[PDB]
């Protein structure tokens, strides 16, 4: 039995559940269906105190905890992946993992929609041709046919150019750093000559 392959690999025991919950939701094309099923349970814990008591209190019996979730996830809002996840997480008392199994589910989802969220921060505000130019420059830094979602910010400590913040990497094409590396190379080279 081999599943769809996950977009990105993640760490264990809370992101290992999300890696499998994503795989049995991409088998029925329910990736966007079980995602807001997850988001509604994030909200249900903000509302209800007897629902979050089934994830923090260690003195609720495991017979009770697996029969409240099974006796409210019926006849509406099931999706049969959400309905079987939260009755599996209530068996082992792992309902407190619902917050971080959601977070790592999005990190598989956002790498499945192929968007890399970006931040381009330049010296002066951009006009129309600079935007099309550095967008073409910045799409040579995404490691797929990824759809860059450039963010624009202003920092005049840069004297022209741009610096791209991918939140995982940073490529600093600015001219202030070009001046700094120029001067470091010059002071490096005149002491070897």
């Amino acid at each position: 039995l081999k599943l769809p392959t996950a977009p990105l690999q993640l760490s264990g025991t809370s992101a290992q559940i999300a890696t499998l919950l994503w795989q049995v939701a991409a088998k029925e094309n329910q990736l966007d269906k079980v995602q807001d099923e997850l988001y509604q349970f994030i909200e249900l814990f903000k509302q209800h105190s007897e629902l979050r008591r089934l994830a923090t209190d260690p003195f609720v019996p495991t017979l009770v905890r697996t029969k409240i979730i099974s006796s409210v996830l019926k006849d509406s809002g099931a999706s049969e992946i959400t309905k079987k996840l939260f009755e599996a997480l209530a068996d082992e008392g792992a309902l407190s993992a619902l917050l971080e199994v959601t977070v790592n589910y999005e990190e598989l989802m956002l790498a499945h929609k192929k968007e890399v969220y970006c931040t381009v921060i330049t010296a002066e505000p951009l006009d129309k041709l600079e935007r099309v130019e550095l967008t073409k420059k910045a799409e040579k830094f995404v490691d797929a046919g990824f759809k860059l979602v450039m963010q624009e910010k202003i920092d005049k400590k840069l004297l022209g150019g741009f610096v791209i913040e991918f939140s995982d990497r940073r490529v600093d094409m600015s001219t202030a750093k070009k001046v700094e590396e120029f001067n470091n190379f010059v002071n490096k080279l005149v002491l070897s000559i």
Partner: peptide
Amino acid sequence: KALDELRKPKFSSKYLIQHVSQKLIPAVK
């Protein structure tokens, strides 16, 4: 915040994924 009590999870089982896996994958059609 009223969701801080679920910030980090605690598990009674190192093989939690081995129980979730036998209940998630038979639930597909």
